[PDB]
Design a protein around this ligand. Structure first.
Ligand SMILES: *CC(=O)c1ccccc1
Length: 230
């Protein structure tokens, strides 16, 4: 019996498009009048951050603020502009003003809460996860918010999932996890017997469909699956 439904953050609740728009305005405010194409700075920022997150996958937690400030200090020295000491604050402000939820998030979160435990499991520092849920107005729709900072390990380490299930007081077999990253999400949640639901909004992850238990393009399909199984 499924009694809990857990969600990832980026790509599941808040749109990658909104994050890309926010990230661009972040690099813009960092550069100001500096003669560096903010688009080139962003592409290089995403390349370095992808490499960093890959090195830390499944490993002990390190503050994301430190990891990202390290990347931007390297980019500042590379291109010659002043490292903004308030980079973290700028990222928070812009993320909150231009971040947006997918059109069906609130509807889905409401239909689930009350019937099942509704939780989030995210690779991010707890401060930023809470501030972003608040800026998007959906913090009160979750019964639990579980972060790599709390568990001490990044996904797909099982501890972050273990902690989520413990907060809800359910077994893995009684829980669903929804996300768009086949390895960190389906693989990490499958270790505990959770039902994995892959979210492929644009149908770009067909090569990983055969490993996750279910695949959906819209979160409104999650409620259907939970009913089919119960
Ligand atoms: C990249 C991005 O959106 C971000 C980075 C650090 C803190 C908050 C948001």
């Amino acid at each position: 019996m499924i009694r809990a439904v857990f969600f990832d953050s980026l790509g599941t609740l808040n749109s990658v498009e909104g994050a890309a728009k926010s990230h661009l305005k972040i690099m813009e405010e960092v550069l100001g009048d500096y003669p560096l194409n903010p688009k080139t700075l962003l592409d290089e920022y995403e390349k370095l951050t992808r490499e960093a997150f890959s090195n830390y996958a499944g490993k002990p937690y390190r503050p994301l603020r430190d990891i990202l400030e390290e990347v931007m200090r390297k980019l500042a020295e590379k291109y010659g502009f002043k490292y903004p000491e308030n980079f973290w604050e700028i990222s928070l402000r812009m993320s909150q003003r231009y971040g947006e939820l997918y059109p069906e998030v609130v509807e889905v979160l409401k239909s689930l809460k009350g019937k099942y435990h509704v939780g989030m499991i995210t690779d991010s520092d707890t401060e930023q996860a809470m501030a972003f849920l608040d800026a998007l107005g959906i913090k009160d729709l979750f019964d639990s918010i579980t972060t790599s900072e709390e568990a001490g390990f990044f996904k797909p380490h099982p501890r972050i999932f273990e902690l989520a299930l413990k907060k809800a007081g359910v077994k893995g077999e009684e829980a669903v996890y929804v996300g768009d990253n086949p390895v960190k999400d389906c693989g990490g949640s499958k270790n505990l017997g959770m039902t994995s639901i892959l979210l492929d909004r644009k149908g770009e992850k067909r090569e990983f469909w055969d490993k996750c238990d279910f695949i959906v393009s819209d979160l409104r399909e999650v409620i259907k699956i939970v009913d089919e199984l119960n």
